Structure formats: C-alpha cells, structure tokens
Amino acid sequence: PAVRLALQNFDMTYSVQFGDLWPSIRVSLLSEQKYGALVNNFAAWDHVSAKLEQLSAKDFVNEAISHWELQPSPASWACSPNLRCFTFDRGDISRFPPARPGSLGVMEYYLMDAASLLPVLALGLQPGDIVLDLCAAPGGKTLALLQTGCCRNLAANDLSPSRIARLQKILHSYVPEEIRDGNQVRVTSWDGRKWGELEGDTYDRVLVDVPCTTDRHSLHEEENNIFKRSRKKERQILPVLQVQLLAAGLLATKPGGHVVYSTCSLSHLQNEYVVQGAIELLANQYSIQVQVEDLTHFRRVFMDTFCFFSSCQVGELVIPNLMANFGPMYFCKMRRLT
Amino acid sequence: PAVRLALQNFDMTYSVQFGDLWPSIRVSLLSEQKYGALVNNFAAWDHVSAKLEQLSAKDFVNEAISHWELQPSPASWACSPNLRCFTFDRGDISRFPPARPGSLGVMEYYLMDAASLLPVLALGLQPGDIVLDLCAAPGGKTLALLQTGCCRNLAANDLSPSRIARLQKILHSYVPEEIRDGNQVRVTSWDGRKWGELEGDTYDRVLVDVPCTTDRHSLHEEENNIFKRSRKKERQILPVLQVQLLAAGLLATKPGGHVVYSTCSLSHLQNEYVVQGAIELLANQYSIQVQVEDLTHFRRVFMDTFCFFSSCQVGELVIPNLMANFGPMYFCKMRRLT
Amino acid sequence: PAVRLALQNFDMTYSVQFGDLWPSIRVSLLSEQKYGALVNNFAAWDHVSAKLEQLSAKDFVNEAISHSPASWACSPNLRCFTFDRGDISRFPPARPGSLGVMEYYLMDAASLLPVLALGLQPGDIVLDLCAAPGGKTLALLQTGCCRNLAANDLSPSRIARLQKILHSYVPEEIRDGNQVRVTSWDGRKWGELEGDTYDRVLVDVPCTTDRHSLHEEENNIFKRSRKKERQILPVLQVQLLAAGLLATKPGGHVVYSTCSLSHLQNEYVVQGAIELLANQYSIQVQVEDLTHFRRVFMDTFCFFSSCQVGELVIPNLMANFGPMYFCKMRRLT
Amino acid sequence: PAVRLALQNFDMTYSVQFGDLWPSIRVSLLSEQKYGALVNNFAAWDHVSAKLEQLSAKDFVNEAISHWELQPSPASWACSPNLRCFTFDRGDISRFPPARPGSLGVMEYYLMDAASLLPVLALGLQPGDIVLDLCAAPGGKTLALLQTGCCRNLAANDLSPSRIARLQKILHSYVPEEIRDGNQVRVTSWDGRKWGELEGDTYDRVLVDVPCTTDRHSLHEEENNIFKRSRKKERQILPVLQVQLLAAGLLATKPGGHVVYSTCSLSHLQNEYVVQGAIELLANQYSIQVQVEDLTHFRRVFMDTFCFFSSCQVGELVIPNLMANFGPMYFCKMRRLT
Amino acid sequence: LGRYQTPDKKGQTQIPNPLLKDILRVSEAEFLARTACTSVEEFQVFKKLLAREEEES
Ligand SMILES: C[S@@+](CC[C@H](N)C(=O)[O-])C[C@H]1O[C@@H](n2cnc3c(N)ncnc32)[C@H](O)[C@@H]1O
Ligand SMILES: C[S@@+](CC[C@H](N)C(=O)[O-])C[C@H]1O[C@@H](n2cnc3c(N)ncnc32)[C@H](O)[C@@H]1O
Ligand SMILES: C[S@@+](CC[C@H](N)C(=O)[O-])C[C@H]1O[C@@H](n2cnc3c(N)ncnc32)[C@H](O)[C@@H]1O
Ligand SMILES: C[S@@+](CC[C@H](N)C(=O)[O-])C[C@H]1O[C@@H](n2cnc3c(N)ncnc32)[C@H](O)[C@@H]1O
C-alpha cells in the first residue's frame, strides 16, 4: 500500500520531470540495484583490491581520476582521495560476496550504492580538513569520509540514537580503536538544524545528506514508509526540514569552506529548490553569500560509470538505469563566501 | 570570630602551601572580588554583548577560544561552547550594573565569579549530552551548563531544599518556561552521595562542585560559617563527604564519560586529596578505572585572564590576585574508563 | 489596588511577550492616549474634514488608501483625522452640525482598523456581535455598505449608550426601519439563531481592556472577587468567536478583535475557535493574511510584527493608540 | 450467584466495549492469572534476582528499560527506578514458589499481578519526592513505591483499618524497622476524599488506585462481592466515589506535580469517565487545570510483556490474555498545572 | 518604563535602581542610551505629555 502510494506518487511527478526517460528509470527502481565494494584502507587495501579484481570488478574511482587531465588542478585538489570502490562492468549483474574480517580484524570492504560515494568525492576533502557529516547515520558516507585520510577531525551527527548505534557498529567493524575513540572522530545525536548556533563557522567541509523520500527504499520496504497515510504531513513538510538542515550546514561552514548537499530522491522539490531555498535564506536572514560550484567536469569524468540526468540546472543527478542500476543520487557542491 | 577563625586557619595552612605567594592571595581574599557578566543566550545575547562592550568590558571566553589554535581539536570539541562572559580589563575594578529583564522577560546577564565558569567550560559539553550537576544550588554553574545549548537533559541536584528555592528563582528569572518545565531540566533535592545506586552509569558529563570551606565567603559572612566552634566535626569530616560525592558522581557517569570536580577552596586536603581519594575508592571497592585528564592547554589559554597556581599536580587552581580578583577555584577533569 | 493588580499582572505576562519592547509599551499605557476624529458622513463630512485640517490633523485612512497594489480589501468612506506622529494635540469635543447630528466621534484610532480590515462591500448583511457602546457599530454604518446591520450586546445598560450614539450621530431616516437592528442577548447563541446569515461579522469581544484596567478602579476585571470571571475569559471569547463564525454565510468573512496585548485572549482564541468549528461542526475557517493591510497602516500605528495569526497595534508614545488585536477570517465550508 | 451476576454484567457491558476481543479476555478472566515476583531491594536483590533467573524467569522492568532509547529523556527520568519484577516467558504458565524470609529476616520477593507495577512505574518517581498512596491497602503498590528508594516521604492511606493491618503486615515482613519506624513512611486510615482540605498542594507524586468492581476478583470470591443484590447502590455510585478520590489526590498534589489514577476494571465508566469527571470538577469548582500525559512510549516499551487495548482515548489499559494473563489494569498519568 | 522601583518598607527593591548620578548628572543622550534605553524622539514626546499632566491640577 505505502509501496504502491510511493510508486503512484512517482508515476505522477517523475513522468512529468523525466518524460520519455521515466520508464527506463521506473524499471530500474523496481529491479535489483547495483552495488560497489568500497575498499577499507585500514584492512590492507592492496590485497582486497587484488582479491576484488579476480571477480572481474574494477575500481571506478581510479578509472575516473585517470581521465581527470583529459577534457585546471590535480584530481586530488578537486576530488576526495584514496577512495577505492570496485564495481562490475556495464551490464554485468554479478553480486559481491559478503565482506569478511582480515588479519587486522576490521572488515575488508563495504557494499553500497556506488553513487553514494559521489557526494563524498565531490566534496573535495584536502589534507587536514575539519569535516562535519550533519546527517550521518547509518554511516556509509561517514566511512568514506574517514577512508580519505584527510580528516583532522570528523563530526558525525544524526538525530536518531537508534541509527547512531548502526553507525557505531560500522565504525567498530571497519575502523581501528586507535582512530574511532581519539579526538579524530566525534559521534553526536542531536538536531542538525541547531548547528548554526552551536559550532558556527567551524568546518572546512560539510556533508548534508538529508532525510528524503528515499525513492528506491520506499518501493521495497513497507515498514517505516514515508508514503504512509499517517506520515502525510511529515512528507509534505520534508523540503522545509531539508532547507533547515542545509542552512545549518552552511552556517557551520567556515567562510571560504565548502558544502555538499545530497539526497537519494529524483524530486526537484527536494533537490534544486532546497539548494536555492537555503541560499536565499542565508542571503536574506544572515547576509551570507553562497555560490553553487559547477560539477560539469566531475560529471563528465564519472559519466563512464553512471547515468546522469544532464538537464540539471543546479547540482548533478545520477538516475538509475538497468545497465548501471545506481539509485537516485542528487548532489550539489557549494562554497560559502561571506 | 568565625571569620577570624577562618583567617587564622588560612594563615596556618595557606602560608605553608603558597609560601611567599600567600600575602598577594590574603590581601585579595580580604578585598572586593571581581565579577564577570555571564550573558543570557535566551535574552538575545547579541544586544547584551554590544551593551556590555560599551562599558569597556570584553568576553574572556571568546578571547580564550581565539588562541585555542596557538600552542589537536576545535575549541568546541574540548571546551563547552556558547558561553559569553564579560569582564573588565586586568587592573580595572569597575562594577557591572545589576542585570534587568530583557528579550523574553528573562534577565540579560548573571553576575558571578568569572572563575566559576572554568569547571563548566573544562567539562567540555558536546551536543546532545545527558548532564548532571550533583551539588547545583544556588545555580550559577547550572545556569552556565544550560547556556551551552548542548544538554539533551540536565539534572540539577542539591541536598538543601532552601538552596534549591534559590536555584528555582534563578531558573525562573533566566530560563523561559518552555525549557524549565519540560523533560530538559530536572531539579531534585536529595543526597548526592546516593547517586551511585539510583541513576548509575547514566550521564555523559557530571559536575561535582562540592561543599567546601568556601574560603572567601567564610571571611565575609558570620552566619552559617563552617569555622564556627560548633561546626568543628562537620569541617574536619568535610574531605570524607567530598570523596563520597565525587565517587557518586563518577558512579553516575557512563563508562567513557567525563567528570569535573571543583571547589572554591585553596586547601590541598579538599582539592588534590579528594581527586586521588575518589579514584582509589572506585578502583578498590568497585574495580572502576578513572583517568585524570590534563588541562594544561586549557590553563595556558585562560592564563591571560586568571592567576593560576601552576604547581598543581592534579587539576588546576585559580588563585585570587588584586589584578584579577577571581576567588579560589579548584577544578579537575576526569574520564571514567571502565 | 485592582489598577495595581492589573499592572502587576501585565509586568509578569507582557515583559515575557514583548521582552525589551515592554517598557516603551508600559510607559505608553501609563500616559495619555492618542485619539482620532472619525468624521460623521451624515453631518456633511466635507466641511468637518476641512475644519479638522485647520488643526494640522490629517485623515490617516486617505493617506493609507493612496499607498502596494490595490489587492488588499478595505471598508470605504471612513475618514478619521489624527495629529502627526509625535504631536500630542487634543481634538476639541464634537458638536451637533446643521442636521442636528454630531460632526465627529473621538476614539482610539486603532479601533477603526478591525472595521477597515473586515472589508465591507456594497449591500452586505453585517453583524456586530458585541456592539456596545457603539464605536465600531458607528464606523460600520459610516461605510454606507450595510444593507442590514445587526448590533448585539448582552448588557442592556451598554445598549442604552449605543442607542444614545445612534440617536446622536445617525439620522432617523437611516436608523429606522429595517437597516439597523439593536438586540440585547447572549452572542454565544447566534449559531442556533441566525446561522449562515451574515456576509461580514465583527466579534469585538470582552477582554481585560488593558489600558482601561490601569485607569478605572470601578468595575475592574482584576479585582480579587472577579478572579474566576477573568480566568474563564478566553473560554467566553472562543464561544463568541465560534458563534460569529456560525452566523457567517459560507464564503463570508469575520474579524475578531480585542483591546488586550495578551496572547491568551488574542491568537489562542483565533486558534481555539477554528479548531472548535473544524471538530464539532466540520466547518473549515481560513485566517486571511493582513500583511499588506498592516504595511499600509504602519505609517500611523506601531505594530508588533512578530504576530503569528492576526495583527496587533501596540501603544508607543509617538503614536499612543491602545492595544488593538485583530484577525480576519474566511468561512469556507 | 454474585460471581454469576459479575460475569452476567461483564458479558453485557464488555461484549459491547471490546467486541470480538471480549472472548479472549473472558476466557482469561475465568482461568489462572499470571504473577510477577517483585524483588525486595532490602533483602539483597542480586541473589534473589540470580535465584529467580534459575527458574527461566526474566525481569520485565529491565527488558523494558533497555528499549527505552529505541522508538527524549533517560528511562530513570520518565519511569520509576530500581523496580525488579520477574515473570515467566510469554505462554509459560509456571508458578513462582512462595516467598521465604531471607538474610535479614525479610521476605525475598512479593508475588503480584505484574500489571499492578505499571501505575507505579508510570508515576515516574524522582529522587527526593514527597509521595502519597491515597488508597494503599493491602500495600502491593505501596511496597513498590518504597522499593524505588526515591521517596523522601511516603504517605500510605486507606479508609479500612482492617486492610491497613495487612499493609502493616507487608511493611513489617518486607521493610526493615529503620525505615518503617521513621519519618519516611506514614500509615493513616482516614477518608481519602478529605485530602483536598488536609494536606492540599503537598505531594510531588500521588497514586490514586481506587476501589472498583475488581473484575477478576469478583468472578472468584463470593464473600464481600460488590455484585451482591444488597450492594446494588454501592456499586452504582462507585464512579462518584472514584472521582471524589481522584479529585482529592489532585488537590493534594503540588502545582506542577503528577498523579496516576488506576483501577483493576475494564469498565470505561470507572476508567476514562472518572478521569474526565475529575478534570472537569477541578476546572469548574476549583479553577485548577489538569493535563493528561501521553503514555504511548511507555505502552509501546511494555507491549512486549502485556496486552494493551490500544483504542484507549485517555490513559492505558492492560487486558488479560492467555499468553500474558495479567488482569485488568487501567492507568492514567496527569500533571496538575495550576 | 519599569526601570525605577520605589523602595519600601525596608528600603529595598526587587532589582536595584540606577544610581542618582546616572539618572541626573549624566547627559540626556547618555541617560537615554545607558539608563532609560529608549529613543530620543520618544522622550521628547514624554516631556510634552508630562508638562501637560503637571499643568492640569
Ligand atoms: C539519508 S540518511 C543519511 C545517510 C548517511 N549519510 C549514509 O550515507 O549512511 C538521512 C538521515 O537524516 C537523519 N535526520 C533526520 N532529521 C534529522 C535532523 N533534524 N538532524 C539530523 N539528522 C536528522 C535521519 O535519522 C537519517 O539517518
Ligand atoms: C559550592 S555549593 C554548589 C555551587 C553551585 N554549583 C553554583 O555554582 O551555584 C555546594 C553545595 O553542596 C550542597 N550539598 C551538601 N551536601 C550535599 C549532599 N550530600 N548532596 C548534594 N548536595 C549537597 C550544599 O547544599 C551546597 O549548595
Ligand atoms: C469591547 S466591548 C465592545 C466594544 C464595541 N464594539 C465598541 O467598539 O464600542 C465588549 C462587549 O462584549 C459584551 N458582552 C459580554 N458578554 C457578551 C455575550 N455573551 N454576548 C454578547 N455581548 C457580550 C460586553 O457587554 C461589552 O460591551
Ligand atoms: C484497589 S484497593 C488499593 C490496592 C493497593 N493500592 C494495592 O496495590 O495493594 C482500593 C482501596 O480503596 C480503599 N478505600 C475505599 N474507600 C476509600 C476512601 N474513601 N478513602 C480511602 N481509601 C478508600 C479500599 O479500602 C481499598 O483498599
């Protein structure tokens, strides 16, 4: 029912947005998704990389960086480094086996939607950055932010204390005790919208991977479905929350710092209008100027692995396709100027 | 008489402890003390801050945080945030006028010994913490703990129901009804020593600002003076109580949580002897390991405003000086490990 | 004593609501109030207007209407003169003109705003549910839009004052016959009698009359004996507003108003009556935005712009126009 | 006969209330009830807890508290602490052996309807509270209120001096002389309805576990049965008495204090009607505002052990089921505001 | 404005009143900026209102 209401709502809204492209997306959302194996750098990545190559999988992030020169600055200056994520070839539907603990106890790799790595990559972490993950749980992107080896400090926050337990489980599974308990990582459970007041102008890089209508998940799971009749108000006020969280992320960013906003939804209402809305709110209410940064070179380099909806005005959008079934992933990089 | 017995007792003890430094302290204890104006964040702090700057006063907490980078982690990760406390320059004896109600019918600022803010700052509240102020009345440090905007929950306890009335008066004067009537604040009147049994392993941060010989107050007020002949036993058994309260605070702290112990006395028998005494009691009787955390960077940053007795083995001590007459304030941060 | 209990209660309540704005209001409530001269259109308004201009007074309504696009609605033909911002001059008492009717009515200029905001159109069936002593009733008539005007008030003694004003300001040709109807009955019962009848309804409810409660000791709502009556005042107010809405035709409009700064008697009563009609009667009521109306009249009055529902004129020494809360609504279903 | 009149009356009334749920309740009321073993904290609870675990029984108050975080404030803030009550698994019909005097000559545990602990738990005692049990005899809930270790003072009242003897027997059997013979526990045998006049605005927490039609007991015992023909008037005027006692409890509560009203009846006339009636009576006659507090989180956490009739408008209701045969237990938490 | 309470009966107020010098000795601009905390225009009107209050009786 909620699964059917979600599909009913997407047929109305997304047939209009994508037009003749909507069927190819619709079939992909209703079929098995493609995963990437994010290699754990704490678990001796060279052996894991070699092991994953035996399956005929290839690191799409390395493939991308190789062509960074083709078609301004080194890939490391633009794109977050040391992220190795293996995927099978275009059209291949093979599944990675479950990860296992290595000689060091930590798990070899983390299976995830390969597109979920793009907001982290696009955020462009540089060595020594103070980083904030405002909506961090269950920790997929938090894990990737750590893998870069650039975080001087990493703040991971999420309002839900139950999802924070899953984030702690991932940190204990993949990260050595030396790092996860020191002053390098800090896990909090608090409203992300209040970050403007507490910890303003503090972070170099901020990830705002907001709660959204989780388009693909809302078509599979019936429990805790945002399209439930009872959750009608919660779903309609979702773009308010999303702007409030993005604005809080921007207020927590140092002047000159950068922010990546992202969702796993196809709706314009939760994507470009949240970016435009938060930029207006900061310009009017706080007199802070925020510039959207162009990710066209980033897109063009990663087009070899993902299907992008190139008609995006603000930010970029990965649309699912059967050839590369990487779920809806919207993302927009911004720079706080004043 | 009790005022003279207090001074007589301090001449015997503190001349030995501080040596040639005791006169400079003695004259300061027998002269007018310096106050800081803790800005009320519920009362539109920006206008209050601007109004206090007109008097030539400056926020010592902001001055301190600015130099946090000079000579590991952001100031917000180490030091409790959003605390704005104005003081006059070193050597200035100007007095702040009484605060008046402002922005939400709440008092604009709270006048207090500026040093009383240091145990609260040193405790290092992070967003979403469950906090306990075991010996909270009359509420100066309770008020500061609230001002951070980090307390998910704040337990304020004090054995005396008469002093709790003063704490309730401050909460009604400074905090809006929205916060002080909800599940965010809880005022109790019970023996703090019993917190090991009721509410064990519950709090992230615990303040144990124990009853002591209140050295400065004991030299001014004759009523309810601890140095009265009838209160000889009560005063001699004071280090037993102080260990019992600190141990109870540590037992109510979650494993991994932090505790700040503090007094407003120069006596080592109430300060370092209580920290060592409570750490031993928990390791022997309960098999719980407690680590004293180093506040040398914290001290060094705040040395610009306060006179510290740098010869402290465990914890830190602010000694009163005519240039900065901030009363005796001992404080020690600890981490419960097991 | 009751005057001191009133101020004591205000200090507690209103220092919290207005914060650092409360002193400027407090001094204004404890000082002489500013009046506006509502011109009587039945007494040859052109000569009265000219006479009032000689004093350096200006029709604030004419100034407001001249100024934003004409999207906002506003009741017409209301000419009310006030002195400039900062001027404390007093209007002389009004006198009967050439047609034996009074030239103008002195009143709190802000009391005209709920009538203006109600947006009377030609040929409307209008109801003034708590009409006495008749200041706003008089203004409703001045528009020349009322096909019919029902003026009600529970007190028969205050209705005598309303009849005195109607006889003093309105010619017998317009009072009688079927254009005006003065009743003295419980306004809360209008849902049953005369439901879905009126195009426009004014519900200027009984409240703690903040300014009056600091001047007059007799019949003071803050007296020790009147403790229950004062505490149950927001119940009555919701009952009267709900009755006003039930007597409004579907599609019709209602203005609720008070002369209190209390949020308990202002917004909470609007919020309460809308819930009561939605739950008990399944009637939908929409609060209409008066931001354009406010912005146009901000040149004459001090408004507390932080108002969630409705608008509030707060007294200030520059324009000492007493507390005046008002909210426009539309009954949809 | 009175047992048959009770069942006859319940068939008429409760078939309408519960509908198709009434048979499952009816069979449970006419079968053996399930008991919980409330551990005596004065008799070394750790050994008793260990002993009760050998039987395959488990503490449901602990199981419940563990999931308090899942799906605002710590469990201790919301829910009365230190209550350990063991029950057998869902579907298990094992019986606890009788309680025996242990170490200090006191009883090890108290067998009771596990649901009878929920009004005490829901009342949310905090350390140092002044507590009143207006209808305390025979003392099951009084005993639990003491077990928390939160009562500064505990007033236990009951009109019947014969049932007070049973309460004194329980206090002597379970509570050591140090506490029962002190200013901590006060047993009175006066009319509970008169508490508005004597001891008004005094208590922080008040339990009003009123006399009702004791649905389950009235189907077993023929002696002193409320459904006897002679007790027709007494039974019909029972909701008047119930409102009078609840209103008296509320009048004895301090402004801001909390009250739990409870019955062991399924009849809405004795449950929600009495709650609304007492709230109306206080609002009209005394101009006191009383807010019903939502126990949905409390219910949801305890649903794992008890069957609740979730269609309850005000308060909560535990309905008996063969899987968990815990007798009718209605309870509603309130806060006196003015 | 509520910034000056009359002391009674023990010569005590809820909040201490401003110092006589900060009320009278100081300039009108400083009185309004630090003590009264109101605009200049508002006090000019107050002076006119009070003048009229005194003139009558
Ligand atoms: C899409 S998830 C984040 C996914 C995560 N970054 C990852 O890659 O594993 C969005 C999150 O927002 C959280 N959330 C919702 N409201 C919040 C708020 N006000 N502040 C912070 N987090 C919030 C939800 O609990 C949810 O975990
Ligand atoms: C120095 S005062 C606390 C000052 C307070 N934190 C402030 O900053 O305003 C010490 C307090 O310990 C309280 N106290 C004494 N014995 C106690 C006990 N056993 N448990 C709890 N509080 C106790 C005293 O009543 C006194 O208020
Ligand atoms: C603020 S006065 C109305 C002022 C009037 N509209 C004017 O501008 O001159 C409020 C009125 O409500 C009246 N009233 C009180 N209870 C009433 C009720 N139940 N029904 C109708 N009028 C009532 C009072 O007698 C009082 O005259
Ligand atoms: C259900 S029992 C209380 C059970 C008790 N709280 C327990 O858990 O053991 C209800 C009690 O109300 C008592 N009672 C009846 N009328 C009373 C009155 N007017 N005032 C006080 N108690 C009364 C009865 O004697 C009876 O013991």
PDB file of N, CA and C in Angstrom, chain D residues 210-213 232-247 261 263 267-275 277-278 281:
ATOM      1  N   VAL D 210      -7.919   3.488  43.030  1.00  0.00           N
ATOM      2  CA  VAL D 210      -9.269   3.492  43.603  1.00  0.00           C
ATOM      3  C   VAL D 210      -9.953   2.136  43.774  1.00  0.00           C
ATOM      4  N   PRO D 211     -10.931   2.083  44.728  1.00  0.00           N
ATOM      5  CA  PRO D 211     -11.790   0.905  44.832  1.00  0.00           C
ATOM      6  C   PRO D 211     -12.726   0.858  43.630  1.00  0.00           C
ATOM      7  N   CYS D 212     -12.830  -0.310  43.017  1.00  0.00           N
ATOM      8  CA  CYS D 212     -13.592  -0.514  41.799  1.00  0.00           C
ATOM      9  C   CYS D 212     -14.322  -1.849  41.884  1.00  0.00           C
ATOM     10  N   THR D 213     -14.883  -2.324  40.757  1.00  0.00           N
ATOM     11  CA  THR D 213     -15.589  -3.605  40.719  1.00  0.00           C
ATOM     12  C   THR D 213     -14.627  -4.812  40.677  1.00  0.00           C
ATOM     13  N   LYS D 232     -26.177  -3.094  45.517  1.00  0.00           N
ATOM     14  CA  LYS D 232     -26.568  -2.535  44.215  1.00  0.00           C
ATOM     15  C   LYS D 232     -26.318  -1.027  44.176  1.00  0.00           C
ATOM     16  N   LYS D 233     -26.689  -0.303  45.246  1.00  0.00           N
ATOM     17  CA  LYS D 233     -26.497   1.148  45.317  1.00  0.00           C
ATOM     18  C   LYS D 233     -25.014   1.481  45.391  1.00  0.00           C
ATOM     19  N   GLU D 234     -24.276   0.791  46.281  1.00  0.00           N
ATOM     20  CA  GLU D 234     -22.828   0.962  46.462  1.00  0.00           C
ATOM     21  C   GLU D 234     -22.068   0.823  45.130  1.00  0.00           C
ATOM     22  N   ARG D 235     -22.454  -0.169  44.319  1.00  0.00           N
ATOM     23  CA  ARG D 235     -21.834  -0.425  43.023  1.00  0.00           C
ATOM     24  C   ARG D 235     -22.191   0.654  41.984  1.00  0.00           C
ATOM     25  N   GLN D 236     -23.442   1.153  41.994  1.00  0.00           N
ATOM     26  CA  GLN D 236     -23.886   2.166  41.029  1.00  0.00           C
ATOM     27  C   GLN D 236     -23.259   3.537  41.312  1.00  0.00           C
ATOM     28  N   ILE D 237     -23.078   3.898  42.600  1.00  0.00           N
ATOM     29  CA  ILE D 237     -22.449   5.170  42.999  1.00  0.00           C
ATOM     30  C   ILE D 237     -20.903   5.082  43.025  1.00  0.00           C
ATOM     31  N   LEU D 238     -20.323   3.962  42.586  1.00  0.00           N
ATOM     32  CA  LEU D 238     -18.878   3.757  42.594  1.00  0.00           C
ATOM     33  C   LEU D 238     -18.146   4.803  41.726  1.00  0.00           C
ATOM     34  N   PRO D 239     -18.638   5.235  40.545  1.00  0.00           N
ATOM     35  CA  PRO D 239     -17.914   6.273  39.799  1.00  0.00           C
ATOM     36  C   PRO D 239     -17.934   7.646  40.481  1.00  0.00           C
ATOM     37  N   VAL D 240     -18.858   7.895  41.425  1.00  0.00           N
ATOM     38  CA  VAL D 240     -18.896   9.164  42.157  1.00  0.00           C
ATOM     39  C   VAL D 240     -17.715   9.181  43.114  1.00  0.00           C
ATOM     40  N   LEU D 241     -17.612   8.135  43.938  1.00  0.00           N
ATOM     41  CA  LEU D 241     -16.515   7.936  44.883  1.00  0.00           C
ATOM     42  C   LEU D 241     -15.155   8.030  44.192  1.00  0.00           C
ATOM     43  N   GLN D 242     -15.036   7.365  43.041  1.00  0.00           N
ATOM     44  CA  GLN D 242     -13.796   7.317  42.278  1.00  0.00           C
ATOM     45  C   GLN D 242     -13.362   8.708  41.850  1.00  0.00           C
ATOM     46  N   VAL D 243     -14.292   9.532  41.394  1.00  0.00           N
ATOM     47  CA  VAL D 243     -13.989  10.914  41.012  1.00  0.00           C
ATOM     48  C   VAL D 243     -13.624  11.708  42.264  1.00  0.00           C
ATOM     49  N   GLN D 244     -14.358  11.500  43.357  1.00  0.00           N
ATOM     50  CA  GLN D 244     -14.091  12.214  44.600  1.00  0.00           C
ATOM     51  C   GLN D 244     -12.672  11.922  45.091  1.00  0.00           C
ATOM     52  N   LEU D 245     -12.237  10.657  45.006  1.00  0.00           N
ATOM     53  CA  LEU D 245     -10.892  10.271  45.428  1.00  0.00           C
ATOM     54  C   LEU D 245      -9.828  10.804  44.478  1.00  0.00           C
ATOM     55  N   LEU D 246     -10.076  10.753  43.165  1.00  0.00           N
ATOM     56  CA  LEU D 246      -9.092  11.273  42.218  1.00  0.00           C
ATOM     57  C   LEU D 246      -8.955  12.800  42.382  1.00  0.00           C
ATOM     58  N   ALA D 247     -10.080  13.517  42.512  1.00  0.00           N
ATOM     59  CA  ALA D 247     -10.050  14.971  42.717  1.00  0.00           C
ATOM     60  C   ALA D 247      -9.282  15.320  44.001  1.00  0.00           C
ATOM     61  N   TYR D 261      -3.829   7.698  38.218  1.00  0.00           N
ATOM     62  CA  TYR D 261      -5.107   7.131  38.630  1.00  0.00           C
ATOM     63  C   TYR D 261      -5.152   5.720  38.098  1.00  0.00           C
ATOM     64  N   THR D 263      -7.239   1.554  38.193  1.00  0.00           N
ATOM     65  CA  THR D 263      -8.271   0.599  38.585  1.00  0.00           C
ATOM     66  C   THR D 263      -7.890  -0.771  38.076  1.00  0.00           C
ATOM     67  N   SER D 267     -14.305  -1.561  32.771  1.00  0.00           N
ATOM     68  CA  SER D 267     -15.408  -0.620  32.583  1.00  0.00           C
ATOM     69  C   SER D 267     -14.936   0.786  32.317  1.00  0.00           C
ATOM     70  N   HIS D 268     -15.288   1.350  31.157  1.00  0.00           N
ATOM     71  CA  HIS D 268     -14.941   2.731  30.837  1.00  0.00           C
ATOM     72  C   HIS D 268     -15.574   3.707  31.809  1.00  0.00           C
ATOM     73  N   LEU D 269     -16.730   3.361  32.415  1.00  0.00           N
ATOM     74  CA  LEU D 269     -17.409   4.226  33.387  1.00  0.00           C
ATOM     75  C   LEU D 269     -16.568   4.449  34.644  1.00  0.00           C
ATOM     76  N   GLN D 270     -15.706   3.491  34.974  1.00  0.00           N
ATOM     77  CA  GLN D 270     -14.817   3.579  36.119  1.00  0.00           C
ATOM     78  C   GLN D 270     -13.402   4.045  35.732  1.00  0.00           C
ATOM     79  N   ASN D 271     -13.066   4.027  34.436  1.00  0.00           N
ATOM     80  CA  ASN D 271     -11.747   4.374  33.927  1.00  0.00           C
ATOM     81  C   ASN D 271     -11.689   5.810  33.375  1.00  0.00           C
ATOM     82  N   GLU D 272     -11.938   6.011  32.057  1.00  0.00           N
ATOM     83  CA  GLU D 272     -11.831   7.307  31.386  1.00  0.00           C
ATOM     84  C   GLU D 272     -12.868   8.320  31.887  1.00  0.00           C
ATOM     85  N   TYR D 273     -14.121   7.882  32.154  1.00  0.00           N
ATOM     86  CA  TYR D 273     -15.190   8.769  32.632  1.00  0.00           C
ATOM     87  C   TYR D 273     -14.764   9.450  33.932  1.00  0.00           C
ATOM     88  N   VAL D 274     -14.141   8.686  34.842  1.00  0.00           N
ATOM     89  CA  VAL D 274     -13.655   9.188  36.126  1.00  0.00           C
ATOM     90  C   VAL D 274     -12.495  10.171  35.934  1.00  0.00           C
ATOM     91  N   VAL D 275     -11.668   9.950  34.914  1.00  0.00           N
ATOM     92  CA  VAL D 275     -10.550  10.846  34.615  1.00  0.00           C
ATOM     93  C   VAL D 275     -11.078  12.191  34.111  1.00  0.00           C
ATOM     94  N   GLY D 277     -14.198  13.351  34.446  1.00  0.00           N
ATOM     95  CA  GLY D 277     -15.027  13.874  35.517  1.00  0.00           C
ATOM     96  C   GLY D 277     -14.238  14.617  36.569  1.00  0.00           C
ATOM     97  N   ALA D 278     -13.094  14.042  36.992  1.00  0.00           N
ATOM     98  CA  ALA D 278     -12.259  14.698  37.985  1.00  0.00           C
ATOM     99  C   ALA D 278     -11.565  15.919  37.401  1.00  0.00           C
ATOM    100  N   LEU D 281     -14.329  18.614  37.257  1.00  0.00           N
ATOM    101  CA  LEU D 281     -14.642  19.061  38.619  1.00  0.00           C
ATOM    102  C   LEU D 281     -13.602  20.036  39.161  1.00  0.00           C
TER     103      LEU D 281
END
